[PDB]
Amino acid sequence: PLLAAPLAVGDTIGFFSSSAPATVTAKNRFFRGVEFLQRKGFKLVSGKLTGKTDFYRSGTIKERAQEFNELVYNPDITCIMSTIGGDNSNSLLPFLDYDAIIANPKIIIGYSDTTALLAGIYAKTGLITFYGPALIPSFGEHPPLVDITYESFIKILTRKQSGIYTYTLPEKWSDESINWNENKILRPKKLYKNNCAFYGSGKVEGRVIGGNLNTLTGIWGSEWMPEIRNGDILFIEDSRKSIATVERLFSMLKLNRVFDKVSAIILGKHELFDCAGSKRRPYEVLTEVLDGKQIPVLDGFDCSHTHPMLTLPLGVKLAIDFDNKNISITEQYLS
Amino acid sequence: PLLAAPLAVGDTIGFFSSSAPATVTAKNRFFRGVEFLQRKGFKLVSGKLTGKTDFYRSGTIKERAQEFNELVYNPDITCIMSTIGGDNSNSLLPFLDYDAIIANPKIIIGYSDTTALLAGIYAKTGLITFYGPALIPSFGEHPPLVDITYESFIKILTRKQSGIYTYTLPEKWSDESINWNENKILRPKKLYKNNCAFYGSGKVEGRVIGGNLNTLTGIWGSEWMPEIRNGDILFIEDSRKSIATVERLFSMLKLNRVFDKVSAIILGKHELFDCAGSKRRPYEVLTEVLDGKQIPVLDGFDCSHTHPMLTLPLGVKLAIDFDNKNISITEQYLS
Numbered sequence: 268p269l270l271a272a273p274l275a276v277g278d279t280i281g282f283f284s285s286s287a288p289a290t291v292t293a294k295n296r297f298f299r300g301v302e303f304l305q306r307k308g309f310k311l312v313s314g315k316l317t318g319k320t321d322f323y324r325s326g327t328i329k330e331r332a333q334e335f336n337e338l339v340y341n342p343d344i345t346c347i348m349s350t351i352g353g354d355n356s357n358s359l360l361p362f363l364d365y366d367a368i369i370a371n372p373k374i375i376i377g378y379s380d381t382t383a384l385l386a387g388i389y390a391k392t393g394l395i396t397f398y399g400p401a402l403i404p405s406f407g408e409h410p411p412l413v414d415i416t417y418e419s420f421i422k423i424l425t426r427k428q429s430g431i432y433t434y435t436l437p438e439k440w441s442d443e444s445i446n447w448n449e450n451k452i453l454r455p456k457k458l459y460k461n462n463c464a465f466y467g468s469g470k471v472e473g474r475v476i477g478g479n480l481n482t483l484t485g486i487w488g489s490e491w492m493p494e495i496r497n498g499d500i501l502f503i504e505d506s507r508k509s510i511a512t513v514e515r516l517f518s519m520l521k522l523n524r525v526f527d528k529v530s531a532i533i534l535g536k537h538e539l540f541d542c543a544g545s546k547r548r549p550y551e552v553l554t555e556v557l558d559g560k561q562i563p564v565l566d567g568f569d570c571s572h573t574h575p576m577l578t579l580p581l582g583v584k585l586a587i588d589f590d591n592k593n594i595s596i597t598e599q600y601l602s
Numbered sequence: 603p604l605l606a607a608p609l610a611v612g613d614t615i616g617f618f619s620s621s622a623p624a625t626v627t628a629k630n631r632f633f634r635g636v637e638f639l640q641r642k643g644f645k646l647v648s649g650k651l652t653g654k655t656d657f658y659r660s661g662t663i664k665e666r667a668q669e670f671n672e673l674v675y676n677p678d679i680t681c682i683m684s685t686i687g688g689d690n691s692n693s694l695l696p697f698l699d700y701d702a703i704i705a706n707p708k709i710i711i712g713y714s715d716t717t718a719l720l721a722g723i724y725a726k727t728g729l730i731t732f733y734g735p736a737l738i739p740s741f742g743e744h745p746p747l748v749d750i751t752y753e754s755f756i757k758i759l760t761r762k763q764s765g766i767y768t769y770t771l772p773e774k775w776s777d778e779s780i781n782w783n784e785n786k787i788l789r790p791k792k793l794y795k796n797n798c799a800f801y802g803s804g805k806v807e808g809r810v811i812g813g814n815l816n817t818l819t820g821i822w823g824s825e826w827m828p829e830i831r832n833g834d835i836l837f838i839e840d841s842r843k844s845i846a847t848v849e850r851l852f853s854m855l856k857l858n859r860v861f862d863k864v865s866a867i868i869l870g871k872h873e874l875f876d877c878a879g880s881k882r883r884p885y886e887v888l889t890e891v892l893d894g895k896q897i898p899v900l901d902g903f904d905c906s907h908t909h910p911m912l913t914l915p916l917g918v919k920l921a922i923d924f925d926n927k928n929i930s931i932t933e934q935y936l937s
């Protein structure tokens with residue numbers, strides 16, 4: 268695969284708004300995120316649509332593609348980071364400068380709607396992109412959880428590429444929709460013990476593919492959707508969905524023969540899942556959809572909309588040890 | 603194509619709940635729909651999940667598939683009608699008895715989420731199915747709008763298959779979210795003049811394909827999504843969506859090269875579209891996404907979630923005369 272240069276303390280991070288104009292609509296949280304990374308020693312380059320609004324989005328399709336492309340053209344930038352997701356990143360895909368991405372590989376990082384770009388860029392270029400922090404939701408998070416997010420971010424992107432990397436498990440996590448865009452917290456978030464579960468036995472090693480599942484529907488069937496292959500590990504997460512929507516998306520995967528191919532599934536923790544009073548969890552819904560197909564599942568990986576968030580390279584081999592309850596990166600993902 | 607026998611007054615209609623359990627949650631409107639069709643002279647057979655609830659759905663995936671299949675097996679049933687949509691019809695697709703459908707073709711009719719079934723059945727069998735009335739939302743509607751819906755339903759399904767059929771445009775329509783499941787009415791719905799627009803010139807004739815666009819994402823890429831071919835007329839409608847979602851869905855189509863194949867697009871009236879203050883309509887968003895592609899568009903066809911609703915056969919040729927501002931069925935769609 269195509270690999271970007273690793274991150275280092277003091278590097279320049281460029282940010283872009285490929286969908287929701289949250290540098291305006293969540294300006295306080297944005298400023299907190301900016302200050303957080305600056306105090307860590309990073310230099311920041313603001314994308315050209317920072318501070319702009321086109322109602323539900325940061326700008327036109329072409330304006331947003333231009334914003335992203337301009338960061339790719341900047342030789343000083345090591346990391347290109349999403350400000351926030353939304354709904355509309357998939358629009359940009361016909362207009363991204365893929366040749367420039369290949370010529371100037373950089374760390375591309377974000378999550379949620381930005382999945383369209385992460386997956387699309389990988390499909391077109393083979394570049395290993397990252398499911399991880401977006402500036403506003405991830406680094407604008409109040410302490411204590413932001414520190415754990417940062418620890419993963421800096422560890423994954425700066426570590427020496429020697430031997431496997433085994434993930435730490437966050438001690439506590441939260442998904443509460445509070446403390447969003449103000450100077451002070453209203454009150455501390457509920458801190459849940461980590462209830463991540465490893466359903467299965469032995470070790471499964473394979474290329475990880477996926478991201479935000481709802482977002483994948485916007486690129487599905489196109490040349491920008493990476494082909495899922497035999498032996499892949501499917502990584503999927505969703506946010507604030509009804510159980511009805513979760514069944515729909517799982518069945519979509521079933522119909523597409525995804526569950527005939529993959530050797531394991533990683534479910535990211537689902538932020539504020541709405542069970543409609545059924546008290547069922549997404550894993551139970553997946554089990555029904557699977558219809559007896561035995562696939563080992565890591566249920567509740569901390570790489571999703573919940574806090575804290577781990578950083579995950581997409582398109583490289585992972586090993587999930589279901590016996591020892593851990594997950595590792597086993598393939599080089601940066602230069 | 604595989605063609606069902608035409609409907610006749612006095613025939614038996616079977617109904618099924620492939621997703622939301624609205625025979626329970628909208629019981630008053632359900633009873634109104636039942637009484638409406640019975641008064642017209644139709645006999646009704648209730649699917650086995652009528653009156654059942656599994657929280658967000660009528661029952662398990664397999665039970666819902668069985669409910670539908672049992673109606674196919676009933677020799678007295680000439681029309682199989684959805685009670686209502688939801689989110690979860692796509693789950694049923696691996697379990698529908700397609701061979702039984704081929705062996706005894708019937709009129710299959712519904713809309714919204716039921717698109718998954720209409721499209722899936724067409725993909726597997728070539729049966730001409732119908733985008734049209736569901737028992738609860740369509741026939742549980744209060745007069746006067748229900749009468750116009752019924753007029754189309756009965757005309758399309760009972761008429762002699764000789765010569766083209768040209769649609770009659772409803773004089774007035776509504777999308778107002780009142781008088782749903784209430785026993786009585788305080789006032790009639792606000793009525794709007796029909797603002798259907800024909801953007802283009804000349805005449806376009808091609809096979810119509812599509813349905814509820816959001817629902818199509820649940821079957822996309824699979825063997826149950828009928829292939830869109832050169833010359834097709836794309837029919838798409840959505841309900842209660844944000845402009846953000848609408849851009850995402852239009853861009854999905856663009857990425858899939860759909861706009862390189864279609865001869866025209868029909869946009870169904872979008873029930874309670876949320877423009878996010880932009881004052882933009884779906885057509886304007888489509889125009890941006892198209893990026894200069896000169897595809898003629900029928901904007902605001904009355905075959906969607908708005909009232910009244912016309913009945914449309916899927917998978918047969920239509921002719922849209924953009925100069926004379928009309929739309930016709932030009933291919934035999936019942937035996």
Ligand SMILES: Nc1ncnc2c1ncn2[C@@H]1O[C@H](COS(=O)(=O)NC(=O)[C@@H](N)CCC(=O)O)[C@@H](O)[C@H]1O
Pocket residue numbers: 287351352353354378379380381404444445447479481482505506507538572573
């Ligand atoms: N006013 C508010 N109050 C408190 N939390 C808020 C918020 N606005 C955004 N958030 C939180 O910010 C996180 C990231 O938002 S985000 O990136 O735009 N999300 C997305 O793109 C995905 N929701 C799109 C995919 C989908 O679900 O269909 C989400 O986890 C979301 O919970």
Ligand SMILES: Nc1ncnc2c1ncn2[C@@H]1O[C@H](COS(=O)(=O)NC(=O)[C@@H](N)CCC(=O)O)[C@@H](O)[C@H]1O
Pocket residue numbers: 622686687688689713714715716739779780782814816817840841842873907908
């Ligand atoms: N409580 C309520 N008050 C007033 N109206 C209500 C209602 N519950 C349902 N409705 C109306 O019923 C109509 C049909 O509903 S329905 O078939 O389940 N819809 C669907 O399946 C599609 N919404 C799913 C596709 C999608 O948009 O993602 C929709 O037009 C909807 O407006």
